[PDB]
Amino acid sequence: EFQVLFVLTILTLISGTIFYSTVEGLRPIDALYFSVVTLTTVGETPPPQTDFGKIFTILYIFIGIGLVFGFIHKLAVNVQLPSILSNLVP
Amino acid sequence: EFQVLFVLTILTLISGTIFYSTVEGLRPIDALYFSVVTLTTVGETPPPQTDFGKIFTILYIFIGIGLVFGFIHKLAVNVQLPSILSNLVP
Amino acid sequence: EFQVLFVLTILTLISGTIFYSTVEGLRPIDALYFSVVTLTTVGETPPPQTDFGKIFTILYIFIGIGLVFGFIHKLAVNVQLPSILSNLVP
Amino acid sequence: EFQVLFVLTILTLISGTIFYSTVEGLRPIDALYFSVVTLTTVGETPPPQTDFGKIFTILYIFIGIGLVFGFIHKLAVNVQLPSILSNLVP
Numbered sequence: 001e002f003q004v005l006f007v008l009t010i011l012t013l014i015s016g017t018i019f020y021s022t023v024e025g026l027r028p029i030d031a032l033y034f035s036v037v038t039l040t041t042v043g044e045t046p047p048p049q050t051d052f053g054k055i056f057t058i059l060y061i062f063i064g065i066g067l068v069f070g071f072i073h074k075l076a077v078n079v080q081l082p083s084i085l086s087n088l089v090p
Numbered sequence: 091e092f093q094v095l096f097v098l099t100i101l102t103l104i105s106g107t108i109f110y111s112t113v114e115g116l117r118p119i120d121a122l123y124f125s126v127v128t129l130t131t132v133g134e135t136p137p138p139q140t141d142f143g144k145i146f147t148i149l150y151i152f153i154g155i156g157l158v159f160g161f162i163h164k165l166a167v168n169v170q171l172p173s174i175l176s177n178l179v180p
Numbered sequence: 181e182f183q184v185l186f187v188l189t190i191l192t193l194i195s196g197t198i199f200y201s202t203v204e205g206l207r208p209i210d211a212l213y214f215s216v217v218t219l220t221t222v223g224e225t226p227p228p229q230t231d232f233g234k235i236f237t238i239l240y241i242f243i244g245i246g247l248v249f250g251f252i253h254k255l256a257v258n259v260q261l262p263s264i265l266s267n268l269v270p
Numbered sequence: 271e272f273q274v275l276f277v278l279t280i281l282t283l284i285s286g287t288i289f290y291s292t293v294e295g296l297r298p299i300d301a302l303y304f305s306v307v308t309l310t311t312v313g314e315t316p317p318p319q320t321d322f323g324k325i326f327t328i329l330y331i332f333i334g335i336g337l338v339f340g341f342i343h344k345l346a347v348n349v350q351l352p353s354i355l356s357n358l359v360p
């Protein structure tokens with residue numbers, strides 16, 4: 001499960017990285033950062049400058065937020081929880 | 091269900107698009123983008139400049155966030171999940 | 181229930197409005213808008229300029245987000261849902 | 271439970287405060303504020319300026335959001351709820 005969500009999230013981020021680096025002309029690292037803060041709703045970034053960027057962002061958000069949060073919902077509950085939980089055992 | 095939420099979300103976005111393009115004077119595409127990042131809480135945009143814009147945004151958020159997230163909660167769980175889940179079957 | 185959450189949310193917003201209008205020197209409407217986008221995590225606004233503003237925002241977020249979202253979780257599910265749901269009955 | 275989440279959240283914020291104050295060169299209070307609005311997805315702040323800041327933010331978000339929201343989910347439901355709920359008793 002966690003393995004799958006990880007894959008789906010990575011592919012989603014890869015797509016955003018390629019899109020933004022090409023259409024908005026961002027360096028790869030900035031394109032990945034934009035993709036990440038967008039899908040997690042953190043939004044610490046100015047908006048895309050092109051209409052293509054805006055249209056894609058709208059669609060990217062609706063399709064990717066569900067996935068990204070489903071993944072985060074497992075990263076801390078199915079992997080990060082026990083580590084400290086089972087560790088909460090005397 | 092998914093069909094209904096889709097309709098309710100579209101109408102909500104249409105209302106925001108009309109509102110912002112008129113009161114804040116944004117081009118339709120920018121008004122739709124503002125509406126979308128606002129309701130998904132992504133917030134990658136500067137705030138409205140008019141008091142009408144601010145008041146409407148406050149009300150728009152409280153009434154639309156619940157709907158938009160309910161829709162997203164189905165777009166990936168009732169439509170996007172199986173596609174890859176049922177596809178996870180050897 | 182909905183009545184109570186409404187009260188708790190209003191008081192929370194009133195507190196933020198008073199705080200920001202005084203410490204950050206914002207007009208009441210802008211102080212309320214800042215309070216609202218902050219607690220809903222929309223964040224369509226520049227950050228507070230004073231250390232008092234920042235410290236208060238940190239505490240305001242942790243204490244108010246839970247409440248605000250609990251309220252929204254009822255505004256659309258206990259009030260906005262039926263209106264269109266019961267209306268989905270032929 | 272609430273005691274534990276409080277500890278995990280504090281350590282997470284301490285790490286972010288140290289990181290941002292050092293790499294992005296922010297005063298401690300601004301580093302803590304950035305860490306807080308980032309992990310709660312409020313995002314009321316400009317993005318990091320360095321690639322290290324961006325890479326760390328990406329990882330910080332994925333690992334810390336789950337924790338921070340789990341904590342908030344208890345701060346208002348296991349501590350803030352009764353206070354006013356049990357108080358809702360005539």
Ligand code: NA
Pocket residue numbers: 040041042130131132220221222310311312
């Ligand atoms: Na958010």
Ligand code: NA
Pocket residue numbers: 041042043131132133221222223311312313
């Ligand atoms: Na945000």
Ligand code: NA
Pocket residue numbers: 041042043044131132133134221222223224311312313314
């Ligand atoms: Na934001």
Ligand code: NA
Pocket residue numbers: 043044045133134135223224225313314315
């Ligand atoms: Na923002």
